[PDB]
Design a protein around this ligand. Structure first.
Ligand code: HEM
Ligand code: HEM
Lengths: 103, 294
């Protein structure tokens, strides 16, 4: 994908909830640092929902595209109020941007 | 003297599936032009456009409203409180060419209903039969509310729209969608975290976040949050009033009731000033793109 347009998508459709850095801001959504192996959620006092905890799913490139295409369809009852990346070109542009900021 | 009676004549040879083709045309362009207003979409602006055309109604003489759809004329097109709605107009302009049979009143109203359902909001039944009227019936400027007012101004303005306290607090929950623009209305900042997703966050971040009355770059005073949110005075006044607060706290702890109450209030809002016969069909409930496999 394109890691430079993914910076634009994340700043406009994700930064008001999530911050991929090092701390734990947890504005509305949890932090997305080190999204390689987390399955359901993380243990940092962040009150998740019993929607994503059910049936742990490794955060891979192919399944997050399913999650960012339709969030509630992929996880029924998720608190993340997001419309969805209905396109696949910008879905590859964004996931390319996330994986580079998880070191 | 007698008041004006605006009878709703359904479009000649037009069934439910025909209006469903207009809904899909609107809903698809919402998905195509995804980068508008920094990837907010035309969703929020099409809701505000639908309300402003329905907000010029006056129950005392039955003037204004969404029936005539006189937004095509330059009089109410360049109102000082209507700046920024041109984007929703030119959004529906190619659609009105695709379906030249529909009335502008029905297009303007259907656009707002389409936006709420496509933004994961409650289903809003919708009727047809709005008719286009000439220019001499275009409402004058100033029939819309002011952003810098009080809860007393809120309740007094919505009596002219014939809506009680419960319907007002419901319709305000739609303001968690979109963003205020300095170049348009004199207030800057976004309303909520989900810019284009219909949720009850308007009631949550109003009661949970910390608000301070700050000053923006237009000398206007607005209520800003510690998380980046902001509302206008006419909004923040809802919690200054005890009767509104009892409804704000109800919609904040129970989203299901806020969704059911919004539909009836928002349908009533779009149907104000329209006299339907008994031969008129039941109000339509269109299918969203997601329910149609998209
Ligand atoms: C809030 C307004 C918001 C937006 C716009 C958004 C978009 C993107 N997210 Fe997300 N997210 C939340 C908020 C928002 N997100 C919330 C709340 C959650 C938690 C929901 C829950 O069930 O607890 C949330 C979750 C995620 C996840 C899953 C993380 C996990 O399971 O531990 C991911 C991967 C995620 C990322 C994104 C991206 C990318 C967005 C937009 C480009 N959010
Ligand atoms: C007294 C009540 C209200 C007042 C004074 C008011 C005023 C305003 C103002 C000043 C803006 C800024 C527009 C811009 O900067 O472009 C705005 C935006 C908006 N309004 Fe209202 N509003 C009220 C109620 C409502 C209601 C009842 C609805 C819907 C049912 C609504 C829908 C919207 C939406 C969706 C936006 C976002 C527009 C955008 O993002 O461009 N508002 N409102």
């Amino acid at each position: 994908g394109s890691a430079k347009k993914g910076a634009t998508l994340f700043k406009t459709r994700c930064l008001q909830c999530h911050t991929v850095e090092k701390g734990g801001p947890h504005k509305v959504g949890p932090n997305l640092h080190g999204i390689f192996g987390r399955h359901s959620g993380q243990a940092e006092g962040y009150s998740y929902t019993d929607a994503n905890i059910k049936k742990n799913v490794l955060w891979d490139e192919n399944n997050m595209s399913e999650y960012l295409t339709n969030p509630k369809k992929y996880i029924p009852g998720t608190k993340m109020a997001f419309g969805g990346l209905k396109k696949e070109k910008d879905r590859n542009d964004l996931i390319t941007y996330l994986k580079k900021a998880c070191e | 003297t007698t008041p004006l009676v605006h009878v709703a004549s359904v479009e000649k040879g037009r069934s439910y599936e025909d209006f469903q083709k207009v809904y899909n045309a609107i809903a698809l362009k919402l998905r195509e032009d995804d980068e508008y207003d920094n990837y907010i979409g035309y969703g929020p602006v099409l809701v505000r456009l639908a309300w402003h055309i329905s907000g010029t109604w006056d129950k005392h003489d039955n003037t204004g409203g969404s029936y005539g759809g006189t937004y095509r004329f330059k009089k109410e097109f360049n109102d000082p409180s209507n700046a920024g709605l041109q984007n929703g107009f030119k959004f529906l302009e190619p659609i009105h060419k695709e379906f030249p049979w529909i009335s502008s009143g029905d297009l303007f109203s259907l656009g707002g209903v389409t936006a709420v359902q496509e933004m994961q909001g409650p289903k809003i039944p919708w009727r047809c039969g709005r008719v286009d009227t000439p220019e001499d019936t275009t409402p004058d400027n100033g029939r819309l509310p002011d952003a810098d007012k009080d809860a007393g101004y809120v309740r007094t303005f919505f009596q002219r729209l014939n809506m009680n306290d419960r319907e007002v607090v419901a319709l305000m929950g739609a303001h968690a969608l979109g963003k205020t623009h300095l170049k348009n209305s004199g207030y800057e900042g976004p309303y909520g975290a989900a810019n284009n997703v219909f949720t009850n966050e308007f009631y949550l971040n109003l009661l949970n976040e910390d608000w301070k009355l700050e000053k923006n770059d237009a000398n206007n005073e607005q209520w800003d949050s510690k998380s980046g949110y902001m509302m206008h005075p006419t909004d923040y006044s809802l919690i200054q009033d005890p009767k509104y607060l009892s409804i704000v706290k109800e919609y904040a702890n129970d989203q299901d009731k806020f969704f059911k109450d919004f539909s009836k209030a928002f349908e009533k809002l779009l149907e104000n000033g329209i006299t339907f016969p008994k031969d008129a069909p039941s109000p339509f409930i269109f299918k969203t793109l997601e329910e149609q496999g998209l």
